[PDB]
């Protein structure tokens, strides 16, 4: 039932998930000036070399691009994690215009949309168990700017057309996600939830300082998806972004100073 929309939007989604309104909810607003450099902070380790990428599907919420966690082919170590983190699957979430998009913000800034790679602690066996865990998640957020193009991306966006409305999917095979990194890994982190329902708080949230660009017919070809099934009124999939929650009493961490 849930969605981004007036009557089934982030605003009442605490009707069937009451962790909605919990202590650790995402996204937030970094502050950079309140946010603390620790150098303690270990660098990320990102080891996607090894990935197999399986399926690309409109979910109704956003598109996602899934891989094979049955192995450790590509994790994510380091930063702030113990222990490893296999990558299941990738999204994005935009904006109907270039000025609103993200999740996170910096500075109450807003980009034009956020990638998260959503990856599960291999210490609770299987992403079901992980999201009942406070530490059972690592979720890396990336921003994305409009100005050139991301040629990484291209691939993703050449098959948007063939699953344009809810329930479609299509092989998606030989993808490699480390074409949607940034030169830098310098991050932001704290402890916080899955931004979509169920807003299980599971999550230690590693969000990328430096945003990737990406050309405005790349994010155009987002919008053009659609939130409904075929055969029901088309309503564009744009504004899939649950706004900042509140802080409470957490801290964010930099990587850099
Ligand atoms: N914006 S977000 O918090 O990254 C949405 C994650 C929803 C998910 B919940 B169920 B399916 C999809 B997979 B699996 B757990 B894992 B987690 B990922
Ligand atoms: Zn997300």
Not at 92 to 113: I, N, P, R
Request: glycine letters at 8%; proline letters at 7%.
């Amino acid at each position: 039932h849930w969605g981004y929309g007036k009557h089934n939007g982030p605003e009442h989604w605490h009707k069937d998930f009451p962790i909605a309104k919990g202590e650790r909810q995402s996204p937030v607003d970094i502050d950079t000036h309140t946010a603390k450099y620790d150098p303690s902070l270990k660098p990320l380790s990102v080891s996607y070399d090894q990935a197999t990428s399986l399926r690309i599907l409109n979910n109704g919420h956003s598109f996602q691009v899934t891989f094979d966690d049955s192995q450790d082919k590509a994790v994510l170590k380091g930063g702030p994690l113990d222990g490893t983190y296999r990558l299941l699957q990738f999204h994005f979430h935009w904006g109907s215009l270039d000025g609103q998009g993200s999740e996170h913000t910096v500075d109450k800034k807003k980009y034009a949309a956020e990638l998260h790679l959503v990856h599960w602690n291999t210490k609770y066996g299987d992403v079901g168990k992980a999201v009942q865990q406070p530490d059972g998640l690592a979720v890396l957020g990336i921003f994305l700017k409009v100005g050139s193009a991301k040629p990484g991306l291209q691939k993703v966006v050449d098959v948007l057309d063939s699953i344009k409305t809810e329930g479609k999917s299509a092989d998606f095979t030989n993808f490699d996600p480390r074409g949607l990194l940034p030169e830098s890994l310098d991050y932001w982190t704290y402890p916080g939830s899955l931004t979509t329902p169920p807003l299980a708080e599971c999550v230690t949230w590693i969000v990328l300082k430096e945003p990737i660009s990406v050309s405005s017919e790349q994010v155009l070809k987002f919008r053009k998806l659609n939130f409904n099934g075929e055969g029901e009124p088309e309503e564009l999939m744009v504004d899939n972004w649950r706004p900042a929650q509140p802080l409470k009493n957490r801290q964010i961490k930099a990587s850099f100073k």
